[PDB]
Design an enzyme around this catalytic site. Structure first.
Site, PDB file in Angstrom:
ATOM      1  N   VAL A  44       7.621  -3.748  -2.850  1.00  0.00           N
ATOM      2  CA  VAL A  44       8.812  -4.610  -2.208  1.00  0.00           C
ATOM      3  C   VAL A  44       9.250  -5.271  -3.265  1.00  0.00           C
ATOM      4  O   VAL A  44       8.619  -6.056  -4.345  1.00  0.00           O
ATOM      5  CB  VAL A  44       7.982  -5.579  -1.348  1.00  0.00           C
ATOM      6  CG1 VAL A  44       9.308  -6.377  -0.669  1.00  0.00           C
ATOM      7  CG2 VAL A  44       7.159  -5.195  -0.286  1.00  0.00           C
ATOM      8  N   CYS A  70       0.815  -1.069   0.077  1.00  0.00           N
ATOM      9  CA  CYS A  70      -0.158   0.117   0.070  1.00  0.00           C
ATOM     10  C   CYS A  70       0.881   1.235   0.082  1.00  0.00           C
ATOM     11  O   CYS A  70       0.761   2.153  -0.798  1.00  0.00           O
ATOM     12  CB  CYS A  70      -0.902  -0.007   1.206  1.00  0.00           C
ATOM     13  SG  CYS A  70      -1.633   1.491   1.383  1.00  0.00           S
ATOM     14  N   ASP A 109       1.503 -10.276  15.729  1.00  0.00           N
ATOM     15  CA  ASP A 109       0.896 -11.047  14.441  1.00  0.00           C
ATOM     16  C   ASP A 109       1.760 -12.261  13.964  1.00  0.00           C
ATOM     17  O   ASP A 109       2.125 -12.327  12.749  1.00  0.00           O
ATOM     18  CB  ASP A 109       0.456  -9.985  13.328  1.00  0.00           C
ATOM     19  CG  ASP A 109      -0.410 -10.610  12.231  1.00  0.00           C
ATOM     20  OD1 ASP A 109      -0.946 -11.668  12.292  1.00  0.00           O
ATOM     21  OD2 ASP A 109      -0.293 -10.030  11.135  1.00  0.00           O
TER      22      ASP A 109
HETATM   23  C1  LIG Z   1       5.800  -3.367   9.272  1.00  0.00           C
HETATM   24  C2  LIG Z   1       6.799  -3.429  10.509  1.00  0.00           C
HETATM   25  C3  LIG Z   1       7.189  -2.484  11.387  1.00  0.00           C
HETATM   26  C4  LIG Z   1       8.135  -2.766  12.282  1.00  0.00           C
HETATM   27  C5  LIG Z   1       8.617  -3.880  12.222  1.00  0.00           C
HETATM   28  C6  LIG Z   1       8.625  -4.716  11.468  1.00  0.00           C
HETATM   29  N1  LIG Z   1       9.122  -5.866  11.389  1.00  0.00           N
HETATM   30  N2  LIG Z   1       9.325  -6.453  12.509  1.00  0.00           N
HETATM   31  C7  LIG Z   1       9.834  -7.559  12.338  1.00  0.00           C
HETATM   32  C8  LIG Z   1      10.379  -8.375  13.686  1.00  0.00           C
HETATM   33  C9  LIG Z   1       9.663  -8.101  14.858  1.00  0.00           C
HETATM   34  C10 LIG Z   1      10.214  -9.882  13.420  1.00  0.00           C
HETATM   35  C11 LIG Z   1      11.909  -8.181  13.872  1.00  0.00           C
HETATM   36  C12 LIG Z   1      10.259  -7.679  11.145  1.00  0.00           C
HETATM   37  C13 LIG Z   1       9.670  -6.770  10.724  1.00  0.00           C
HETATM   38  N3  LIG Z   1       9.827  -6.466   8.997  1.00  0.00           N
HETATM   39  C14 LIG Z   1       9.661  -7.174   8.492  1.00  0.00           C
HETATM   40  O1  LIG Z   1       9.603  -8.491   8.597  1.00  0.00           O
HETATM   41  N4  LIG Z   1       9.941  -6.723   7.015  1.00  0.00           N
HETATM   42  C15 LIG Z   1       9.629  -7.342   5.998  1.00  0.00           C
HETATM   43  C16 LIG Z   1      10.346  -6.784   4.979  1.00  0.00           C
HETATM   44  C17 LIG Z   1      10.317  -7.727   3.460  1.00  0.00           C
HETATM   45  C18 LIG Z   1       9.471  -8.721   3.540  1.00  0.00           C
HETATM   46  N5  LIG Z   1       9.396  -9.378   2.463  1.00  0.00           N
HETATM   47  C19 LIG Z   1      10.505 -10.121   1.971  1.00  0.00           C
HETATM   48  N6  LIG Z   1      11.497 -10.286   2.376  1.00  0.00           N
HETATM   49  C20 LIG Z   1      12.251 -11.071   1.894  1.00  0.00           C
HETATM   50  N7  LIG Z   1      11.996 -11.944   1.016  1.00  0.00           N
HETATM   51  C21 LIG Z   1      11.324 -11.985   0.577  1.00  0.00           C
HETATM   52  C22 LIG Z   1      10.838 -13.078  -0.343  1.00  0.00           C
HETATM   53  C23 LIG Z   1       9.716 -12.965  -1.088  1.00  0.00           C
HETATM   54  C24 LIG Z   1       8.688 -12.209  -0.885  1.00  0.00           C
HETATM   55  N8  LIG Z   1       7.698 -12.203  -1.530  1.00  0.00           N
HETATM   56  C25 LIG Z   1       9.022 -11.187   0.164  1.00  0.00           C
HETATM   57  C26 LIG Z   1      10.141 -11.348   0.817  1.00  0.00           C
HETATM   58  C27 LIG Z   1       8.791  -9.254   4.578  1.00  0.00           C
HETATM   59  C28 LIG Z   1       8.793  -8.556   5.806  1.00  0.00           C
HETATM   60  C29 LIG Z   1       7.459  -4.833  10.315  1.00  0.00           C
END
Ligand SMILES: Cc1cccc(-n2nc(C(C)(C)C)cc2NC(=O)Nc2ccc(Nc3ncnc4ccc(N)cc34)cc2)c1
Length: 261
Positions: free
Chosen positions: A25, A21, A130
């Site tokens: 990514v 949104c 979550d």
């Molecule tokens: C919104 C928010 C705010 C504050 C913190 C977070 N956090 N918090 C965490 C914790 C608590 C576990 C440390 C992690 C996050 N953020 C996070 O997980 N970010 C994130 C970034 C990129 C992705 N996406 C992909 N990444 C890596 N490979 C892929 C491969 C394929 C694909 N489709 C997607 C991906 C997922 C998650 C998140």
């Protein structure tokens, strides 16, 4: 101005991995050698500072089982850069092509690792809020790191939390329990047939998912512990972890591979 910062030319953006949104990514490269995940902010959709609280949390929370920040570009247009995970979302992995080859021996190991990521969170007095298969990345060699896509998760949410805002590491535990059933039904939505309001109501009357098919009664008993009414009777992640690591020696020594688990 911190040592996480990188030049804008070090990052190539190759494949769109999904328009969220507040930006996109992308899969791509850092310094032309390293497969990387890149998070975009669409200028003026969100306070820069607020998009960047995500990077700030991932600086404090470092673990072999948490998703890992690599770098940031912090002035508009902003980029947040974290490790690429070849397999993507656990949930899609469970329900797609690899779906049918996973057995109980692989699923318990994935759960073992998640618990372990969750134990670091326990130790840090953080709270996920979550936890569920859509928020786990899978990588090579069935590696599973805890993550958060920013992504109403009621079917996975402990009732004290859905009802009274009481979100704790114990309500994370309850979601882990639900996450175990996604692991053991290969990605299926929990509470099949029910709808949000009938989940809140039946769960409060004490209803719980029954043992999935082919799932050992002892794993379901572990689920059932996770889903105790009283937040405090729920196990720690350190229990969950140790238990799952040890599962095939201590609890199912006699275990025999079946059609689906
Ligand atoms: C919104 C928010 C705010 C504050 C913190 C977070 N956090 N918090 C965490 C914790 C608590 C576990 C440390 C992690 C996050 N953020 C996070 O997980 N970010 C994130 C970034 C990129 C992705 N996406 C992909 N990444 C890596 N490979 C892929 C491969 C394929 C694909 N489709 C997607 C991906 C997922 C998650 C998140």
């Amino acid at each position: 101005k911190d040592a996480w910062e990188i030049p804008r030319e070090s990052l190539r953006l190759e494949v769109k991995l999904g328009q969220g949104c507040f930006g996109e990514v992308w899969m791509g490269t850092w310094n032309g050698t390293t497969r990387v995940a890149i998070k975009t902010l669409k200028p003026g959709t969100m306070s820069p500072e607020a998009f960047l609280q995500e990077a700030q949390v991932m600086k404090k929370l470092r673990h072999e089982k948490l998703v890992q920040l690599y770098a940031v570009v912090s002035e508009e247009p902003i980029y947040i850069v974290t490790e690429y995970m070849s397999k993507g979302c656990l949930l899609d992995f469970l329900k797609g092509e690899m779906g049918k080859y996973l057995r109980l021996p692989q699923l318990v190991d994935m759960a073992a690792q998640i618990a372990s990521g969750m134990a670091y969170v326990e130790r840090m007095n953080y709270v996920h809020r979550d936890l569920r298969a859509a928020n786990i990345l899978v990588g090579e060699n069935l590696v599973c790191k805890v993550a958060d896509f920013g992504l109403f998760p009621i079917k996975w949410t402990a009732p004290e939390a859905a009802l009274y805002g009481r979100f704790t590491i114990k309500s994370d535990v309850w979601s882990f329990g639900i996450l175990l059933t996604e692991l053991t039904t290969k990605g299926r939505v929990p509470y099949p047939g029910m709808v949000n309001r009938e989940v809140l109501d039946q769960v409060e009357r004490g209803y719980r998912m029954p043992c999935p098919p082919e799932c050992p009664e002892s794993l379901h008993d572990l689920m059932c512990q996770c889903w105790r009414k009283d937040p405090e009777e729920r196990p720690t992640f350190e229990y969950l972890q140790a238990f799952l690591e040890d599962y095939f020696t201590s609890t199912e020594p006699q275990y025999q591979p079946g059609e689906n688990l």
